[PDB]
Amino acid sequence: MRIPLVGKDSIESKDIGFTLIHEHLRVFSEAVRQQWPHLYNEDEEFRNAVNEVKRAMQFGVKTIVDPTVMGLGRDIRFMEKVVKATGINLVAGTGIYIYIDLPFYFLNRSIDEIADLFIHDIKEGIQGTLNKAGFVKIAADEPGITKDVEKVIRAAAIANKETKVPIITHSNAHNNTGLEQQRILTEEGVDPGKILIGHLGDTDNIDYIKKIADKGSFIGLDRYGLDLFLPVDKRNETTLRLIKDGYSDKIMISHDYCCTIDFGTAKPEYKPKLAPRWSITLIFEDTIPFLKRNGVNEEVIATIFKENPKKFFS
Amino acid sequence: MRIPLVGKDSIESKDIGFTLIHEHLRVFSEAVRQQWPHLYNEDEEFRNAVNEVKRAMQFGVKTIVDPTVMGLGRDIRFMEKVVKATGINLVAGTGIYIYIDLPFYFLNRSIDEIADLFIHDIKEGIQGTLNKAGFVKIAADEPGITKDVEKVIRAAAIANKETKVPIITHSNAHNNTGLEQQRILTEEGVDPGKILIGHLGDTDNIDYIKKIADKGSFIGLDRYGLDLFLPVDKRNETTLRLIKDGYSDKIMISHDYCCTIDFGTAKPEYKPKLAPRWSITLIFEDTIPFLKRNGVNEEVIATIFKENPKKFFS
Ligand SMILES: [Co+2]
Ligand SMILES: [Co+2]
Ligand SMILES: [Fe+2]
Ligand SMILES: [Fe+2]
């Protein structure tokens, strides 16, 4: 009775256990799928998601937090099917994922109207179901904090203040967007500790990463396997350094793995080059063993994968 | 055997009869409706579309061309239901309606891949049905001809050359986007006579409008009732002037009426000042009577509403 789960009763934060804080069962462009369904194969998508989740659970993963929201093809019914097939604790969210402008629907609509949509999903349920959103997801990338991106950020603050659900962000590690997201949210009264600033693992700029952590938010070292952003070994060195410097209190680790994704970039021919080892279990195969080889004890691993997600949702 | 119709056998273009070349039974943002279905009322959308179409048919309209495509919430099954309830000849299209960037799906995808989507809808059918697209719709607006906007334009040209279907455009009457669309399309081998450059009625800049007609394309005096773009009176003066100057064989007239539309701008509160007399029959109430009482004979009216559409689809 605190964090809502897809297809299950809500749980107290103490029960979320070992968590992958940022993974995607399936990503797609809503308009493209609606207009050209011939491009997609739901049987295969389902098989891929179930296979990945099952493998994560074999390594001891108990909860997966999936920040697929509007703009990334959130489908609560698909998520339900995956839960039924696996027994995973799955946390779904609400929010809006844009880089530049909002859909035309939002022309001449207020920040409050936007926040009302998030609050609907949190208090009433997602897409006509009784599965409730447990967090709000927002984004900014290369384009920076555009007017509409800012509106969404402020709407998320409103939803958090009314419901107390935490906020997960997508940012671009190289252009200050994460720092700006944290600034706007905290200025609007969001507890910095209820924010995860995403994709900071995409850079080895430790000063930037620490600056965000020092302002009180979790830092998302959350794209392990996506070498095109930063290779696994560079990520490992950055993660280790932050741990040695005492930042385990703010570190969160994940893969941002998409079991299926429709971006032209994610075509299989590009995988060997851009993300050869990208999967939902890479951190068990490489990262965690690497950290242990370098003196990181199990208490720090537990802090990152258990205590931190617990605090985030408490 | 020439123009495909939703829910009917195809017709020869000679049988198209009195036509409204640009109207929308329903417009919505795919992503918003997918994520927040509570915002929408299907019963109300259906009743409104049926009511409008019936009233148009009472005024003698035989065929409505509906350029709702990806980005505007095209729904071929909704369209089928409206046809069943009214008996209207309805021409559905394919294409992509964007102002800035394409959906993330299109990252690292070619112009050919986009064209293939349009060719699919034209040759195979729309959204898993055998209802086929009879034209391609593209857009550009305030942001101008962005990189992605241009990709879509070039994809439409490929689709036209392969299938011979005409092209309808959305443009902004004040920033040369219409002229640019025409230029790129014609450079890529599209017959200027198979292009309708849209929303030119939004300006009283007669020289700009004529330039597009002179280069061989139909001109869309197609937003009658939308005073926020240009009041009915100013539209009528422009239309009349063009006819007197000998442009009736390039003129097409419509309302761009949306029987339902989800833009925040379309809230009923704004209707009195933004579009007080806007409907799918405004031209029968105001425009055609205005033209006829100003020296425009029955042959010219037939050219605009019967001959030009026939030629466009021939
Ligand atoms: Co992200
Ligand atoms: Co338009
Ligand atoms: Fe993600
Ligand atoms: Fe339109």
Residue numbers in the entry:
A (entry chain A), B (entry chain D): 1 to 314
The authors write:
PLLs are natural lactonases endowed with promiscuous phosphotriesterase activity. A structural analysis of SsoPox, a hyperthermostable counterpart of the PLL family from Sulfolobus solfataricus, has revealed that loop 7 is shorter in SsoPox than in PTEs; linking the active site to the loop 8, which forms a hydrophobic channel that accommodates AHLs aliphatic chain. Indeed, W263 is located at the start of loop 8, involved in the dimer interface of the enzyme and positions the lactone cycle of the substrate onto the bi-metallic catalytic center.
Compared to wild-type SsoPox, variants W263L, W263M and W263F are the most efficient at improving specific activities, ranging from 30-50 and 20-35-fold at 1 mM and 100 µM, respectively. These variants constitute the Phosphotriesterase Selected Variants group (PteSV). Variant W263F is the most proficient (kcat/KM = 1.21 (±0.26)x104 M-1s-1), followed by W263M and W263L with increased efficiencies of 23.3, 14.1 and 4.6-fold, respectively, as compared to wild-type enzyme. The impact of this substitution is such that SsoPox-W263F hydrolyzes nerve agent analogs with remarkable efficiency (kcat/KM is 8.85 (±2.99)x104 M-1s-1 against IMP-coumarin), whereas the wild-type SsoPox is unable to hydrolyze this compound. The catalytic parameters obtained for CMP-coumarin (kcat/KM = 8.23 (±1.04)x104 M-1s-1), IMP-coumarin (kcat/KM = 8.85 (±2.99)x104 M-1s-1) and PinP-coumarin (kcat/KM = 7.08 (±2.58)x103 M-1s-1) hydrolysis enhanced catalytic efficiency 10- and 60-fold compared to the wild-type enzyme for which no activity was reported for PinP-coumarin. The variant W263F was also assayed in the presence of SDS, because anionic detergents have been shown to increase the phosphotriesterase activity of wild-type SsoPox. Thus, the W263F mutation might then mimic the SDS effect, by bringing local flexibility into the active site. Regarding the PteSV group, while these variants exhibit higher phosphotriesterase activity, they demonstrate mild improvements for the oxo-lactones and no or wild-type-like AHLase activity (W263L-M and W263F, respectively). The diffraction data for W263F and W263I-C10 HTL crystals were collected at the Proxima-1 beam line (SOLEIL, Gif-sur-Yvette, France) using a PILATUS-6M detector.
